[PDB]
Amino acid sequence: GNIGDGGGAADRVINQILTEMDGMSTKKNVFIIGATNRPDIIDPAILRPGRLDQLIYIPLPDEKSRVAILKANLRKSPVAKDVDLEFLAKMTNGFSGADLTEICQRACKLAIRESIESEIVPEIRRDHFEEAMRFARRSVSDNDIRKYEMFAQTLQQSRGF
Amino acid sequence: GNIGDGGGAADRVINQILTEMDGMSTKKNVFIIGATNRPDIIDPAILRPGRLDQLIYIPLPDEKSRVAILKANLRKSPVAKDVDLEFLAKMTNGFSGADLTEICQRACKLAIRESIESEIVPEIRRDHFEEAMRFARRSVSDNDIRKYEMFAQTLQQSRGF
Amino acid sequence: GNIGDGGGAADRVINQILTEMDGMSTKKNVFIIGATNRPDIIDPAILRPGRLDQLIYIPLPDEKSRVAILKANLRKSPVAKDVDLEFLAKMTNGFSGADLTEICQRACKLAIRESIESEIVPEIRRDHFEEAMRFARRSVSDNDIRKYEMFAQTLQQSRGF
Ligand SMILES: Cc1cc2c(C(N)=O)cccc2n1-c1nc2c(c(NCc3ccccc3)n1)COCC2
Ligand SMILES: Cc1cc2c(C(N)=O)cccc2n1-c1nc2c(c(NCc3ccccc3)n1)COCC2
Ligand SMILES: Cc1cc2c(C(N)=O)cccc2n1-c1nc2c(c(NCc3ccccc3)n1)COCC2
């Protein structure tokens, strides 16, 4: 990793699976899907035209997905109607799914503390999301982004070399 | 690979096969054929004069082969006569067999989608190949080419050293 | 160049011109245009927002320009009508202006020799371009191309750093 060895990053566990996936007939309905995060160090051996032909890029979530993740990760919480779901996605532009989830995690974590502290009503208010807004961080940097969408348009050139 | 180790790229699986292929008599009709893509890192031990004597170079496909690959990879498809087989090879000059195949793959893939979409006639038209023409890429670069045909004329010098 | 020095590639002839071009008022009609071929080693000092704001990329010539260059570089030659201007641009896809010009230069050079040799009629025939077709070379490689169109979409990131 990172620097790497003197040769290719091949393995006796990679060759045996890439050979196994070639014995199957084309008419079987089995579908294998691979996932990675650093597509520059994987061997082109599995990227050969006939094992991994189609390459699909997953970009950053857009507005329609950002609003959906928030309506999904709190489906079992009594969130009040005072908050606005689209508004959060309106500020959130350069955040990934981990950031969008951890914002809601922080908001729920602070709300659940004041809920118990008031015992010495149990609903999430707008300020609860507001505190989580300011403590937001960026899971990914900027330089790696353009690295990712420079492999998207020019990727067939890496096959074979 | 790539950089390589401190010594030669020899192996106990290479020496045992190069020794095995020397025990056979010359009058047997068994013929062994090797194939590689980076003929600068293989040991000259198997390239000795008496195991791998003749060296044969495979250049890029020419016009006559480019037209043939297209007439071969779609032999089981109802392609209409509106398209021209020679015309595609006329534009395609600096593409390899993988590119020539993936062009037809893309054209068939887009045609098969509109065929189903029209259900809400099943033949490949000229525009179907036209879209695949623009999304063409180059499997190989340019610098590696002259690398390949500089080993073709001067190769006996690498034997023994 | 190439490797470069330990610091920036600044000069007392670059600073004095970039300072001089800032003294002029915006209402003057003087327009300065710069041209380069390796836009990764020039200082961002002249690329500051207010001296060189707009960045314009010159891609490879397309079909409409390839046919035009041929109709332009032989405007003073008695070329016969047997040849086809669009046909040459139909084969020529991955060639730059220097290659397109040198093809015509070679064709004219071989025609002018047989014109004198026949003295022991003076028009360019199809075979004259045909010989020049086979001796064609590529002025630019492939790896530098994707290098050029990877700076085109992501260029504002290089400003300031
Ligand atoms: C708990 C949860 C965590 C999480 C994370 C994460 N970094 O933890 C990343 C992506 C989705 C995630 N989800 C998630 N989980 C689900 C859904 C959903 N929304 C749609 C979606 C998913 C991925 C992409 C776009 C949009 N998101 C949809 O309902 C079922 C489960
Ligand atoms: C599906 C197919 C894929 C493919 C590929 C590839 N990169 O996937 C490369 C070369 C030939 C290929 N073929 C192919 N397959 C066949 C033929 C044929 N044409 C003649 C030829 C072959 C190699 C060379 C020149 C010309 N081409 C001939 O009929 C039988 C099978
Ligand atoms: C002799 C000549 C050489 C040359 C070269 C070269 N590497 O020597 C490169 C580009 C244009 C060139 N020309 C050239 N010269 C001219 C024209 C023209 N065609 C239009 C054009 C120009 C640049 C770009 C696209 C298309 N091309 C147009 O008429 C006047 C002079």
Q: Is C150 on the interface with A (CB under 8 A)?
A: yes
In this complex, the residue of A8, A49, A154 whose CB is nearest that of residue B98 is A49
* DSSP code of residue C28: S
- In one-letter notation, the amino acid at residue C53 is D
Residues 86-105 of B with CB under 8 A from A: 98-99, 101-102, 105
Cβ C157–A150 below 8 Å, yes or no?
A: no
Chain B residue with CA closest to C138: the answer is: B142
- Cβ B43 vs Cβ B10: under 8 Å: yes
HSE on the CB side for A111, CA within 13 Å? Answer: 21
Cα–Cα–Cα angle for C145, C149, C153, nearest 5°?
A: 170
CB of C72 shorter than 6 A to ligand 3: yes
- In one-letter notation, the amino acid at residue C36 is T
Breaks in chain B (C to N > 2.5 A) come right after 120
Nearest Cα to Cα of residue A69 among A57, A78, A61, A59? A61
Q: Is B143 helix (H, G, I), strand (E, B) or coil?
A: helix
Cβ B138–A156 below 8 Å, yes or no?
A: yes
Please give the class, per CATH, of domain A63-142.
special
From residue C112, alpha-carbon distances to B112, C74, C101 in Å are: 54, 14, 16
Tokens of C9: 């590639």
Element (H, E) at B16: helix B12-20
Which residue matches tokens 């914002």? A103
- Cβ C129 vs Cβ C107: under 8 Å: yes
For C16, residues 6+ apart whose C-beta sits below 8 A from its C-beta are none
Nearest Cα to Cα of residue A100 among A115, A89, A111? A89
Find residue A79's DSSP bridge partners: A124
Alpha-carbon distance B84 to B86, whole Å? 6
CATH T-level assignment (fold) for domain C63-143: Arc Repressor Mutant, subunit A (6.10.20)
B16 class by beta-carbon count within 10 Å (0-12 exposed, 13-18 middle, 19+ buried): exposed
Cβ A157–C146 below 8 Å, yes or no?
A: yes
